[PDB]
Structures are given as structure tokens and as C-alpha cells.
Design an enzyme around this catalytic site. Structure first.
Site, PDB file in Angstrom:
ATOM      1  N   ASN A 165       0.786  -1.341   0.044  1.00 50.33           N
ATOM      2  CA  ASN A 165      -0.104  -0.005  -0.074  1.00 50.33           C
ATOM      3  C   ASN A 165       0.876   1.104   0.038  1.00 50.33           C
ATOM      4  OD1 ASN A 165      -3.091   0.481   0.304  1.00 50.33           O
ATOM      5  ND2 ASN A 165      -1.909   2.040   1.477  1.00 50.33           N
ATOM      6  N   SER A 167       0.112   5.370   0.523  1.00 44.52           N
ATOM      7  CA  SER A 167      -0.993   6.340   1.140  1.00 44.52           C
ATOM      8  C   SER A 167      -0.001   7.347   1.542  1.00 44.52           C
ATOM      9  CB  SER A 167      -1.445   5.563   2.418  1.00 44.52           C
ATOM     10  OG  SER A 167      -0.830   5.304   3.381  1.00 44.52           O
ATOM     11  N   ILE A 168      -1.015   8.402   2.106  1.00 47.88           N
ATOM     12  CA  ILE A 168      -0.307   9.772   2.760  1.00 47.88           C
ATOM     13  C   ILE A 168      -1.200   9.851   3.905  1.00 47.88           C
ATOM     14  CG2 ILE A 168      -0.041  12.166   2.230  1.00 47.88           C
ATOM     15  CD1 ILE A 168      -0.767  11.529  -1.003  1.00 47.88           C
ATOM     16  N   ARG A 170      -0.266  11.667   7.846  1.00 50.65           N
ATOM     17  CA  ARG A 170       0.459  12.803   8.420  1.00 50.65           C
ATOM     18  C   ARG A 170       1.435  12.186   9.442  1.00 50.65           C
ATOM     19  NH1 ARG A 170      -3.945  15.763  12.267  1.00 50.65           N
ATOM     20  NH2 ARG A 170      -3.164  14.860  14.320  1.00 50.65           N
ATOM     21  N   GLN A 187      -8.032   3.203   7.614  1.00 51.50           N
ATOM     22  CA  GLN A 187      -7.060   3.536   6.339  1.00 51.50           C
ATOM     23  C   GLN A 187      -6.393   2.124   6.456  1.00 51.50           C
ATOM     24  OE1 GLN A 187      -8.756   5.821   5.177  1.00 51.50           O
ATOM     25  NE2 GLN A 187      -7.208   7.795   5.454  1.00 51.50           N
ATOM     26  N   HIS A 188      -5.813   2.100   5.037  1.00 54.24           N
ATOM     27  CA  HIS A 188      -5.107   0.785   4.849  1.00 54.24           C
ATOM     28  C   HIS A 188      -3.499   0.828   5.367  1.00 54.24           C
ATOM     29  CE1 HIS A 188      -7.402   0.327   0.926  1.00 54.24           C
ATOM     30  NE2 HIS A 188      -8.187   0.080   1.897  1.00 54.24           N
ATOM     31  N   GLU A 230      -1.307  -0.073  -5.002  1.00 52.22           N
ATOM     32  CA  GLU A 230      -1.306   1.416  -5.615  1.00 52.22           C
ATOM     33  C   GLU A 230      -0.249   1.204  -7.036  1.00 52.22           C
ATOM     34  OE1 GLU A 230      -1.699   1.158  -2.661  1.00 52.22           O
ATOM     35  OE2 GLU A 230      -3.563   2.258  -2.045  1.00 52.22           O
ATOM     36  N   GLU A 279      -5.551  21.254  10.534  1.00 52.38           N
ATOM     37  CA  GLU A 279      -6.077  20.266   9.622  1.00 52.38           C
ATOM     38  C   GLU A 279      -7.197  20.732   8.251  1.00 52.38           C
ATOM     39  OE1 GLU A 279      -8.160  17.748  12.654  1.00 52.38           O
ATOM     40  OE2 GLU A 279      -6.168  17.009  13.545  1.00 52.38           O
TER      41      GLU A 279
HETATM   42  C1  LIG Z   1      -3.650  14.606   0.049  1.00 47.85           C
HETATM   43  C2  LIG Z   1      -3.506  14.396   1.588  1.00 47.85           C
HETATM   44  C3  LIG Z   1      -4.301  13.306   1.990  1.00 47.85           C
HETATM   45  C4  LIG Z   1      -4.419  13.004   3.442  1.00 47.85           C
HETATM   46  C5  LIG Z   1      -3.690  13.898   4.505  1.00 47.85           C
HETATM   47  C6  LIG Z   1      -3.023  14.925   3.837  1.00 47.85           C
HETATM   48  C7  LIG Z   1      -3.017  15.215   2.429  1.00 47.85           C
HETATM   49  C8  LIG Z   1      -2.222  16.372   1.838  1.00 47.85           C
HETATM   50  C9  LIG Z   1      -2.283  15.735   5.119  1.00 47.85           C
HETATM   51  C10 LIG Z   1      -0.907  14.911   5.335  1.00 47.85           C
HETATM   52  C11 LIG Z   1      -1.854  17.154   4.783  1.00 47.85           C
HETATM   53  C12 LIG Z   1      -2.759  15.557   6.271  1.00 47.85           C
HETATM   54  C13 LIG Z   1      -3.376  14.412   6.805  1.00 47.85           C
HETATM   55  N1  LIG Z   1      -3.712  13.502   5.892  1.00 47.85           N
HETATM   56  C14 LIG Z   1      -4.022  12.038   6.040  1.00 47.85           C
HETATM   57  C15 LIG Z   1      -4.611  11.306   5.272  1.00 47.85           C
HETATM   58  N2  LIG Z   1      -5.260  10.371   5.746  1.00 47.85           N
HETATM   59  C16 LIG Z   1      -4.938   9.831   6.983  1.00 47.85           C
HETATM   60  O1  LIG Z   1      -5.346   8.833   7.432  1.00 47.85           O
HETATM   61  N3  LIG Z   1      -4.115  10.358   7.889  1.00 47.85           N
HETATM   62  C17 LIG Z   1      -3.532  11.857   7.582  1.00 47.85           C
HETATM   63  O2  LIG Z   1      -2.921  12.010   8.684  1.00 47.85           O
HETATM   64  N4  LIG Z   1      -4.884  11.912   3.901  1.00 47.85           N
HETATM   65  C18 LIG Z   1      -6.208  11.158   3.368  1.00 47.85           C
HETATM   66  C19 LIG Z   1      -5.820   9.638   2.870  1.00 47.85           C
HETATM   67  O3  LIG Z   1      -4.161   9.898   2.054  1.00 47.85           O
HETATM   68  C20 LIG Z   1      -6.597   9.166   1.896  1.00 47.85           C
HETATM   69  O4  LIG Z   1      -7.670   8.697   3.029  1.00 47.85           O
HETATM   70  C21 LIG Z   1      -6.277   7.788   1.340  1.00 47.85           C
HETATM   71  O5  LIG Z   1      -7.400   7.371   0.771  1.00 47.85           O
HETATM   72  C22 LIG Z   1      -5.566   6.960   2.219  1.00 47.85           C
HETATM   73  O6  LIG Z   1      -4.958   5.702   1.274  1.00 47.85           O
HETATM   74  P1  LIG Z   1      -5.631   4.075   1.601  1.00 47.85           P
HETATM   75  O7  LIG Z   1      -6.843   4.100   0.964  1.00 47.85           O
HETATM   76  O8  LIG Z   1      -4.414   3.464   0.773  1.00 47.85           O
HETATM   77  O9  LIG Z   1      -5.442   4.040   3.220  1.00 47.85           O
HETATM   78  K   LIG Z   2      -4.229   4.973  -1.505  1.00 48.35           K
HETATM   79 MN   LIG Z   3      -4.883   1.513  -0.262  1.00 44.78          MN
END
Ligand SMILES: Cc1cc2c3c(c1C)C(C)(C)CC=[N+]3c1c([nH]c(=O)[nH]c1=O)N2C[C@H](O)[C@H](O)[C@H](O)COP(=O)(O)O
Ligand SMILES: [K+]
Ligand SMILES: [Mn+2]
Ligand SMILES: Cc1cc2c3c(c1C)C(C)(C)CC=[N+]3c1c([nH]c(=O)[nH]c1=O)N2C[C@H](O)[C@H](O)[C@H](O)COP(=O)(O)O
Ligand SMILES: [K+]
Ligand SMILES: [K+]
Ligand SMILES: [K+]
Ligand SMILES: [Mn+2]
Lengths: 499, 499
Positions: A165, A167-168, A170, A187-188, A230, A279
Site C-alpha cells: 500500500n 498512502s499519505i 501525516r 485507513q490501509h 497502488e 487540519e
Molecule cells: C492529500 C492528503 C491526504 C491525507 C492527508 C494529507 C494530504 C495532503 C495531510 C498529510 C496534509 C494531512 C493528513 N492527511 C492524512 C490522510 N489520511 C490519514 O489517514 N491521515 C492523515 O493523517 N490523508 C488522506 C488519505 O491519504 C486518503 O484517505 C487515502 O485514501 C489513504 O490511502 P489508503 O486508501 O491506501 O488508506
Molecule cells: K491510496
Molecule cells: Mn490503499
């Protein structure tokens, strides 16, 4: 390398688009870089590239702010997103979301392993780096740490090897060799962490790659299905296998052109203070620190003249709106269609702080279903709010075919005029809630459960015999030939695209 | 005569402001005038003055569209409204609403009777006019009649003589000497009509004056209290007694400078087909004709070169938004304060199609009340939704002191992020509803009852110890000295009032 496949080329593309400001004088990573970026995001200005960051040493690092934020003009409003995907800069949101969904009924194209790449140009072992000595930004004045990780990709793999996986999530600096961050259900990264915890034998092999291929960061941000790697989705979307290089200290693979790579482990046992952070919904709650996941960093590799992307997130409009909201909406549209619901389009209005998704209904199909509002709302809300793609979304607004869900004025019009409060809504209290919304985690009810609603802005005849109104607007209230005459004589009379 | 006291002078003021387009070539009152006006209103262009209306005869009539609509620039956005009131064109909405409320704790200044005025320059007895032969506009293509009355003032008096009401209620041509229109509860024209019906002895003496003093049309549109004669409220607001002339055929009094006056009777027994009409919420329902009140016209008097004001109402933004919504909000603010509720400001967001009112709470006062959301929402909603001033409003949004309720982006932000659907809301089903909202009169429930809600966008600590967040925005997330530095260096770095 093309812009969508290589972050360094993406930066060049922004420059060539006249969509970049290079700031070559010293800028402080303590608040100043993020303040500039915040102002950019609130005004839809050019992305800032900080070439002279106070504290930059031996190549770590420059900063690019606002990588996925909006441009001022309407014609290329989403151009920065289009540049992640090889689309023309004038692409519509519909075209962007369709591109992101395209790989969903294609065979994956798995990645290709190459022996080296730019991300190996420089390295620092565990005697040679200190995370506290890097120019990691303080993004908001009340943040509980320096958030190094706002636009990189976490890489973790299931114990069995079958799902990798990206993902983004923080993360902030904890000490010289550790980060803390959010790892939360559904989340994944959390799902994979749970697999390793249940196995109980070791910490999770992990890497965090910053300045990855733009198409890869988009997929990172998208809630593609459980168990789908991904890298292979991005390969199918782009038509090309992504080039990956093995980490030095573990057997994970990172994009060859990553700007900066951290290698190490995500603990199955340890935690540390994390947050608060300013946030996506526009708030920070000073002093709200809680225990988060803890990552140990064993090695850093990086490109010459490495660039760290940063999201200065908060009030409208930044990557958390343009990417989290829109990409969730895209996945929700597909989920609805796969559940035989007559949804054509979905979008998370910016005006809702991306807490709503508007769902455009094909009302001819709806009429054939011979249903009612109560029944249909319940069906839609069960499908969406019981699924991970619905996680961040607390209100669904059902609208008919006349509404462009990508235009927030029209969504607001329809919501305000077609959905009777209470009667035309169904509340969902027994679904997962998104605790980061202030009314959830800092509100009057359970942080993790409920607070969701389906708001039906379909009018009664949309379920039966068809729309029975015309808008009281210039487009609908006057015949074609008159409209055209008015338009043709407009400036003659005395009255007032790219831009 | 000053602009706020004389419609003809108001037109001159708009010209001098470069806020008028004079169209001296022939324009068709069948749709064309209204199409131009509609386009003006949707684009915030200059008001159109139609000097050459096809069908104009013996002085009846020219048309001014968009008399109370918005200007393009932010600095003088409400300038046309300011010109109704002798305020500077840069006046804020707060200043406009305060001006409209100012007479509420002043002695009335009753009107002055003068022997003649411009409105007597020409006359037509009941052998000399035919309403069907005048250039009355067709405003929307599906309207059920030609709506002569969209910006004139109906004048009716209680049987006992003690209350003379001025209001704006729509009316259309029925035949050569009659109009039909809406006369509905709880409006004051309806309340007075009911008094005459209960007396049962005659039809209601009536006049309809078009092109009245601008300050008078504003008060017409405002829900000032039951039993209060608008003429004396306007006198107190403006500091001057308004000059009125007696009608020729009844003992009512009309403004001396009215452009056009109809004299006659509002029947206590007869009705006729009325509607449909393209309405304030943005819709018309073609074919929805219902029986309305019926007015008999016995005499017309008018100025030389008479000008008829017209509202081409519908989707944003026109007089139905700027005046109905804002003036209701003003009255609601006062009502709340008189009921000891800690409300500082109120406004009906345009984005809500003026179906919401946002109420700004003085949270220090709220904290002293030692109350809860549930209790406070119920108290607010009882006061407002049980009162005539709340008639048109279906959602109240409570917000704390950080929110500028006159800025719809901020209201939407607060609503979406601070009010948990369901839990933080109280529904009101046993209150009068506004049937013109599509989800009411064309919806799933009773047209006349319920469908109202109080949405609490106050956060929990606003009731107890005080706000516990900072916004994640440029203003709040960075110190003063940094902000100023960024601003001072903005254009130097490479980044981009009246407008
Ligand atoms: C674009 C983007 C996506 C953030 C994000 C941010 C951005 C800029 C931040 C870094 C600036 C602030 C926080 N973010 C988080 C986040 N998801 C999460 O679980 N924790 C985070 O702490 N996401 C959302 C997460 O990336 C999406 O929910 C994806 O679907 C997670 O991938 P997954 O389906 O494989 O779990
Ligand atoms: K993802
Ligand atoms: Mn995923
Ligand atoms: C500015 C404005 C106000 C309209 C109005 C319009 C405009 C332009 C129209 C003419 C274009 C369309 C319809 N309008 C009606 C209306 N009120 C009503 O009862 N029937 C109407 O038919 N109003 C609102 C009414 O004027 C306010 O509710 C006043 O408070 C009524 O005065 P009152 O308190 O003395 O009853
Ligand atoms: K509905
Ligand atoms: K009135
Ligand atoms: K609340
Ligand atoms: Mn009144």
C-alpha cells in the site's frame, strides 16, 4: 522523464506553465515557508519553490509548497492536478476523476525493478543524520511538532507479501531518528499495521518517499479498494510500469526518482505524542496532543538538490480539499454504480469544507426503480457510509440531472431549495464517523460514530413522472432566439474565457 | 428632491453613479425587458432603464429594472440599496440594516398632506384605460400573467383607520380593470383584508403606487411590527415627514412623487386565477395557477414620462434576495435582542437562496446564561419561528463571534464544520412554513407547516469556558510580524480595493 512520472520534471512543468515562483533568498522553515504557502492557497497563486531554506545542509532540502492547489483562472483552475496525470491543463474535474478511476477496470501493470535511480545519489546512515537538524517546517504556529510528512507516500506491505500500500498520512518529527503520526481505522496503513500486530513477531518494514511520481501521489491519496497495490493501479492508469528501486535496509521498493526516502520500521508496540496539527477542516485545537504511531528511521537516501513537497493545509483551498475530497467523491461514484445505484457524477463541494458529497442522479433510471425518497436515501447511505470510501464524508446530497455537482453554487441552490429539513433527510448514527471534523472529535457526541446524513434534494416528481419546473434564470426562462439577441446586443446596449 | 425621497431623483442618482444603462431603442415588454434585467441581475451589471418600451402610449410607461440589485465591485456592492436610504454607496450591509432598524426605537414622524404632486400630472378614468393595453411585462416565459406589480407598494388601511400598511405583494393583470395577486397569511395586507372581511360591509379601499420614494419601498419590504404604519416609520428613519396626496376616488394617501398610482378596491368576496410566477427561490412550476385575491382598478394617475420599476426575480441576485432576505434578517436580529437572546448580527446568506438566517452570538453573554445547545436552540427557534419576521426563513444557523455572518463563505464554513447533523439541530414541525419554497409547496409534506430547523454551529466550549481553537488560516495560524513581512514582500518575491 515525463512530469507525471517524475517529481523533478513536474517542478519544471510548473515553471514552464508560469505556475511557479522560485524564491532564492533565505526563507525560514519555522512558519515563514508555510505562511507564504498558506497565502498562496487562500488566493490561488503560483506554487512557491523555496530554493534557499534556512537550515538546508548537504542537500537536504528545498521545499515546494502548494503542489496540488488551485490556479486563479477558471480555464486552468485544476491545472496543477492535471499536471500530475499527463492531462491538458484545462482538464475538467470530471476528466481528472475519470482518469483516476480509469484503472479500476483494467489489469494492473506491476512495477519494474531497476538497479538504481536518482533517489540513490546521496545517503545517510544512522550515525550521519538527525531529523531534528533538518529544515523540517513548522506549518502552523500551534502545531505540536514539525510536520515533515504532509505530501510523501508511506509504503507498507502485508505480512504475506501480497499487498503493498501507498498512502499519505501525516507525520511529525519525534526525535533524531523517529517520527510520530496518525495511523487510524479504516485507513490501509492501519489495516496493514493490524496484520503485523496480530502476527506479533516484528515491527512493520516501512519506507516514506517524498517527491514521488505525481501520478503515484494522486493514487496514494485515493481510497482505491482493500488489497489493491497502488503501484499496479498507477501503472494501469498511466499505461506504463513504474520503475522502482529496492530500499538499502529492507526489501521494500520505492520510486526510482523519489526526491527523499526514509527507510525504517513502523512499531507494533510503541507510541509517542502526536499533534495537534492544523487540519483540512480549517482548525487547530492547541494543546490537543494524543499518542500516535511511532516510526523509526534507519536510513535516508536522496537526490542531489532534493526537493520536499509540503502541504500548508487548513482553510480553503489546498491539497486536502482538492485531493482528499475529490478522490473520495470519485470512489464513491464508482461504488454507487457498482451497487446498481443510478449515480452519474459525484463531487465534494469546497464550500462544505469537503464534508459533503453531491451525487448526481440519472433520474430516468430512478423513475424506472419505482421507489421513494425514504427508501432511496436509505439505500444510498447504507452503501456509502458503510464503506471506507465514505469515511470522510458526513452529508450526501442527492440532486437531479439539472445540477452540475462540480459547481458548488448549484449544489447549494439545490440543497437549500429542494431538501426539506428533517423530512427529506435520513440520519445515520451507527456508522463510522470522521473524528477530525470539529463537530465530531470536539463536539457533543461520540467522536467515532454517527453524525451522518443523506439529504434528498430530488423533487417528488423526479421519482415519478419527471421534472415539473423550469428555473427562473436567464437560461431557462427565455427562448433561445431571445437569449441570443440579448447576448448579441449586450455590449452595443452599454453592458459589460482564458483570463 | 433627494434620491431617497423621490424615485425620479433616484434614477438620476443611478445615472450619475455610472450605475444605469439607458436603452433608447425599442424594447419589447414581452420577455425582452425582463431577459435583459435577468442577465443584469445574474451578472451584477448596471440597472437598465427602458426609455422606449414597445406599447408605451400617452406616457405609460418606461421601465427601470434591477432597482435593488447588486453592483459588481466589492467596494460598492450594496450601493443601489444605499441610494434608497441616503447612505454612502460604500455602506456595508450592517450599516444598511442598522439604518432600516433605526426607526424602531424612535417616535413615528407622521406624513404631511399636500394638495398636489407630480403623481397628479396625468389621469385616466375608468372609460379611458385598459390594463391589457399597457406595456405590462411578461417577466418569465411560463408566467401565468403579465406581472405589472413587482416593485410597487400596496396601500390598505384597517377599518378603524388606525393602521395604514405599505407592502410589496405581487400582482398580475386579470383584465382591463382588474388585477389578481397573492394575499396570504401572515402578511399585513392579508391581516387587514381579514379585518374588512369580518366587517363584511365593503371591499377594501386600496391604492398601488409604483415608483415611490426609495426609502418607502424599503420599509414596504420589511416586516416591521403589526399595527405600525410604515409611513411614520419611514419618516422617523429619514428624519423627515413624507409628503402624501389624497387619492381622487378614495381617501387613501399616496406619495406625492409616485410615478404611477392605481386606485380602487381589493375584493372581500371575489377571486381569480393567479400565477404561476418565477419566484425568489429560482423556480417556476408551469401551469400551477391557483385562485388569488382580486383588485378592481377605478383610476390611474401618473407623472409625465412615468417610469415603472420592475424586479425580474429568480436565481441570484435580485431584489427578492437583497431586500426580502436581508430585511427579514434585520427584524429577526431585533426580535431576538428584545427577547433577551445574545444575538449581535443576522443575515440571510445568498448562498442559501435566502432561506437561512445566520445569527451571530455574543458568546460571553451566552456563557453567562449557563445553558446548553439543546435548550438554547429551542429558545431561539421558538422566538423566531413563531413570529411573522421568521416566516420566510427555514433554517437558523447559530455561530459564534469569530464568524462574519455577512460573508457567506464563512457561514458555510462554520455550518459545515461545527454543526453535527441531527444531534446539533432541532426540528420545528408545528410552526408556519413558507409555501413558496419548492420543498414546501411542491414537496413531500404539508405546504404550510413545518420544515424548519435550528442548526447550532456553536462549539461546546462556547457555552462554557470559551473558544478552544485557532483557525488554520493565514490570519490566525501565524504571528503578526510574520504576516506583515509576507505581505510586505509578496510582490517582490513574484506573487500577485475599489475595482
Ligand atoms: C492529500 C492528503 C491526504 C491525507 C492527508 C494529507 C494530504 C495532503 C495531510 C498529510 C496534509 C494531512 C493528513 N492527511 C492524512 C490522510 N489520511 C490519514 O489517514 N491521515 C492523515 O493523517 N490523508 C488522506 C488519505 O491519504 C486518503 O484517505 C487515502 O485514501 C489513504 O490511502 P489508503 O486508501 O491506501 O488508506
Ligand atoms: K491510496
Ligand atoms: Mn490503499
Ligand atoms: C422586495 C419584494 C418583496 C416581496 C415580493 C417581491 C419583492 C421584489 C416580488 C413582487 C418580486 C415577488 C413577490 N413578493 C411578495 C412579497 N410578499 C408577499 O406576500 N407576496 C409577494 O407576492 N414580498 C415580501 C413582503 O414585501 C415582505 O414580506 C414584507 O414584510 C411585507 O410587508 P408587511 O410586513 O407590511 O406585510
Ligand atoms: K426532496
Ligand atoms: K412592510
Ligand atoms: K455544534
Ligand atoms: Mn406592515
Amino acid at each position: 522523464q515525463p512530469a507525471h512520472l517524475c517529481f523533478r520534471s513536474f517542478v519544471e512543468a510548473l515553471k514552464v506553465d508560469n505556475d511557479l515562483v522560485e524564491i532564492n533568498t533565505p526563507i525560514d522553515p519555522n512558519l515563514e515557508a508555510a505562511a507564504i504557502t498558506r497565502r498562496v492557497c487562500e488566493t490561488n497563486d503560483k506554487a512557491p519553490l523555496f530554493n534557499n531554506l534556512i537550515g538546508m545542509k548537504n542537500g537536504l532540502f528545498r521545499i515546494l509548497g502548494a503542489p496540488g492547489s488551485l490556479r486563479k483562472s477558471s480555464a486552468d483552475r485544476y491545472g496543477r492536478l492535471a499536471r500530475h496525470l499527463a492531462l491538458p491543463p484545462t482538464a475538467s474535474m470530471r476528466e481528472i476523476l475519470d482518469k483516476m478511476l480509469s484503472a479500476s477496470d483494467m489489469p494492473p501493470i506491476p512495477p519494474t525493478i531497476v538497479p538504481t535511480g536518482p533517489c540513490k545519489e546521496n545517503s545517510l546512515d544512522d550515525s550521519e543524520f538527525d531529523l531534528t537538524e533538518l529544515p523540517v517546517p513548522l506549518i502552523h504556529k500551534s502545531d505540536g511538532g514539525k510536520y515533515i510528512q504532509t505530501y510523501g507516500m508511506h509504503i507498507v506491505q502485508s505480512p504475506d507479501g501480497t499487498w503493498t500500500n501507498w498512502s499519505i498520512a501525516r507525520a511529525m518529527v519525534h526525535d533524531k531518528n523517529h517520527l510520530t503520526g496518525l495511523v487510524i481505522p479504516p485507513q490501509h496503513i492501519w489495516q496493514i499495521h493490524q496484520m503485523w500486530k496480530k502476527e506479533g513477531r516484528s515491527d512493520v518494514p516501512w519506507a516514506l518517499a517524498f517527491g514521488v511520481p505525481p501520478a503515484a501521489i494522486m493514487a496514494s491519496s485515493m481510497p482505491i479498494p482493500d488489497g489493491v497495490t497502488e503501484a499496479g493501479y498507477v501503472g494501469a492508469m498511466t499505461g506504463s510500469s513504474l520503475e522502482l528501486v529496492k530500499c538499502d535496509t529492507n526489501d521494500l521498493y520505492v520510486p526510482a526518482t523519489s526526491e527523499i526516502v526514509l527507510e525504517g520500521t513502523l512499531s507494533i508496540s510503541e507510541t509517542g505524542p502526536e499533534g495537534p496539527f492544523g487540519e483540512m477542516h480549517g482548525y487547530i485545537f492547541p494543546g490537543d496532543t494524543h499518542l500516535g504511531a511511532k516510526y523509526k528511521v534507519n536510513r535516508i537516501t536522496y537526490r542531489n538538490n532534493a526537493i520536499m513537497p509540503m502541504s500548508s493545509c487548513g482553510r480553503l483551498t489546498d491539497e486536502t480539499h482538492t485531493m482528499i475530497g475529490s478522490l473520495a467523491a470519485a470512489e464513491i461514484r464508482k461504488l454507487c454504480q457498482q451497487n446498481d445505484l443510478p449515480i452519474t457524477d459525484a463531487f465534494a463541494p469546497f464550500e462544505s469544507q469537503v464534508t459533503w458529497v453531491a451525487l448526481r442522479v440519472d433520474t430516468e433510471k430512478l423513475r424506472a426503480m419505482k421507489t421513494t425518497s425514504e427508501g432511496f436515501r436509505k439505500r444510498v447511505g447504507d452503501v456509502v457510509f458503510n464503506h471506507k470510501a465514505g469515511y470522510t464524508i458526513h452529508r450526501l446530497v442527492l440532486v437531479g440531472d439539472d445540477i452540475d455537482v462540480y459547481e458548488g453554487k448549484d449544489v447549494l441552490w439545490a440543497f437549500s431549495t429542494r431538501c426539506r429539513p428533517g423530512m427529506d433527510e435520513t440520519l445515520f448514527e451507527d456508522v463510522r464517523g470522521f473524528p477530525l471534523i470539529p463537530y465530531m472529535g470536539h463536539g457533543n457526541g461520540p467522536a467515532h460514530r454517527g453524525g451522518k446524513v443523506v439529504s434528498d434534494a430530488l423533487m417528488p416528481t423526479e421519482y415519478t413522472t419527471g421534472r415539473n419546473w423550469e428555473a427562473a434564470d436567464f437560461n431557462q426562462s427565455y427562448p433561445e432566439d431571445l437569449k441570443q439577441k440579448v447576448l448579441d446586443n449586450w455590449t452595443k446596449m452599454g453592458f459589460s474565457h482564458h483570463h
